[PDB]
């Protein structure tokens, strides 16, 4: 159902150590698929998922050009924002851009988004109607006015509603095995004595895709007021994700506790228990 | 693909 094509753009000024660093990464859902980074001789857009490794030079020549154009404009906007805020050339600044389009279960445009940030804070946001912008301050208001005069919202909406959606379809086809054929969690419980009278039960979910998951501990098929340590979901490096959730329990009472796992890749939610 | 449209701030 809900799929998305998203880019994350980072540009960092390097005062008198060359032009700004510019990096652009592309994701479909939770899968990275391309990248451009202007630290090389020829910086080029390059595949970062196997299912792109068979795209021809029409794709890479265009996306290289487009990425270089993007870097250049970001150098311009970094200069411009330096002026607005009356900052010296000595200091390093960061400009970030995130945009994406989402599909609904009908395969059609459902929503788009686009945000700029300067030095790690909101600067300029495209509103939900993709027709207008919100500025955080006086400087961003100048940016709003320039975008109004230029019909930037119209241009971005055209990308988000048409082009973005068209390519997101193409990518979901090319990458079906990764993107549509999900990976359920391989799931297990480990047991770690803490003291003479209590142990940690740790519920592992491993090798799953996509990232979204729910891990829950139940005592007697009901909630508890117990110590419930949950780690941030983390990449395994292989395209999949890992998570665990731990509860500390009275030694001998481990069979009262059950781990509940929900993931889009499972036919049905799974439950789980420490197996001595 | 990337946006063909680049806002000037």
């Amino acid at each position, epitope marked *: 159902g809900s799929h998305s094509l998203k880019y994350f753009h980072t540009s960092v000024s390097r005062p008198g150590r060359g032009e700004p660093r510019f990096i652009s990464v592309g994701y479909v859902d939770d899968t990275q698929f391309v990248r451009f980074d202007n630290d090389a001789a020829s910086p080029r857009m390059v595949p970062r998922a196997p299912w792109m490794e068979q795209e021809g030079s029409e794709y890479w020549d265009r996306e290289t050009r487009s990425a270089r*154009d993007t870097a250049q404009i970001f150098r311009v906007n970094l200069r411009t924002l330096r002026g607005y805020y009356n900052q010296s050339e000595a200091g390093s600044h960061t400009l970030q851009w995130m945009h994406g389009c989402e599909l609904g279960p009908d395969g059609r445009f459902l929503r788009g988004y686009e945000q700029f940030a300067y030095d790690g804070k909101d600067y300029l946001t495209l509103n939900e109607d993709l027709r207008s912008w919100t500025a955080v301050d006086t400087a961003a208001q100048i940016s709003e006015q320039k975008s109004n005069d230029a019909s930037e919202a119209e241009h971005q909406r055209a990308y988000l509603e048409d082009t973005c959606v068209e390519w997101l379809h193409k990518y979901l086809e090319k990458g079906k095995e990764t993107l549509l054929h999900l990976e359920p969690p391989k799931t297990h419980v480990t047991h770690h004595p803490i003291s003479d009278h209590e142990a940690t039960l740790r519920c592992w979910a491993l090798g799953f895709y996509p990232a979204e998951i729910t891990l829950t501990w139940q005592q007697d098929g009901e909630g508890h007021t117990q110590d419930t340590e949950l780690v941030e979901t983390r990449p395994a490096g292989d395209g999949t994700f890992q998570k665990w959730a731990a509860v500390v329990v009275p030694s001998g009472e481990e069979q009262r506790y059950t781990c509940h796992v929900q993931h889009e890749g499972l036919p049905e939610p799974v439950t789980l228990r420490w197996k001595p | 693909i990337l946006s063909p449209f680049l806002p000037l701030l």
Partner: T-cell receptor, first 111, second 111 residues
């Protein structure tokens, strides 16, 4: 020839609706323009369109259909000042060479 | 906003000639198109920003340079009758958005 317009000239009665069509060959096109050029003058932008659909401004309407790769302009209530050459231009994102122009269509508004 | 000079120009075969173009909008992109009678604009050369140039559809006979944002001169090396034409400079915010053209340069090359 990537951008196609009939040279014409086309005749329209004063007061009547004029319609102008433009096709383009590359599905990579992402931006579309109608320019008007008076004899011996420079192209002036009439309208711009980017989203698939209809777009209205005063007497002018444009239509973009990316599935069928055409753009069109409609001029309601044609006046003598609409007598000009109308230029179609597309931005082809696959080639990147700024705007590619059609050969133009001349419109004579006859009173 | 786009100041192109000169408006008219006659040249002898073999002469060289620089058309000037300046813009006050401080935009990155600048272009040179030519237009022969009854035809559309064809791109000669363009510049993505200060320091950079790129060929267009019909680069032959012509050089360009871009030291500054503001200016983008076109240079005929060795004038030929085929280069009798109207030349239009433009400025653009993005590669594929609205071209803002200058007033144009009508140029005839005579033996």
């Amino acid at each position: 020839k990537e951008v196609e317009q009939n040279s014409g000239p086309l005749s329209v009665p004063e007061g009547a609706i004029a319609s102008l069509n433009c096709t383009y060959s590359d599905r990579g096109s992402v931006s579309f323009f109608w320019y008007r050029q008076y004899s011996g003058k420079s192209p002036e932008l009439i309208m711009s369109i980017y989203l698939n659909g209809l777009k209205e401004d005063g007497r002018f309407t444009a239509q973009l259909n990316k599935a069928s790769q055409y753009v069109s302009l409609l001029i309601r209530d044609s006046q003598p000042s609409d007598s000009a050459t109308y230029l179609c231009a597309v931005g082809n994102h696959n080639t990147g060479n700024m705007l590619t122009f059609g050969g133009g269509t001349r419109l004579m508004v006859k009173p | 906003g786009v100041t192109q000079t000169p408006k008219f120009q006659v040249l002898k075969t073999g002469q060289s000639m620089t058309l000037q173009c300046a813009q006050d909008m401080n935009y990155e992109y600048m272009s040179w198109y030519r237009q022969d009678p009854g035809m559309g604009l064809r791109l000669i050369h363009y510049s993505v920003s200060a320091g950079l140039t790129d060929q267009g559809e019909v680069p032959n006979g012509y050089n360009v340079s871009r030291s500054t944002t503001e200016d983008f001169p076109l240079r005929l090396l060795s004038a030929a009758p085929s280069q009798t034409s109207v030349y239009f400079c433009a400025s653009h915010r993005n590669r594929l958005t609205e071209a803002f053209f200058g007033q144009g340069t009508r140029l005839t090359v005579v033996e």
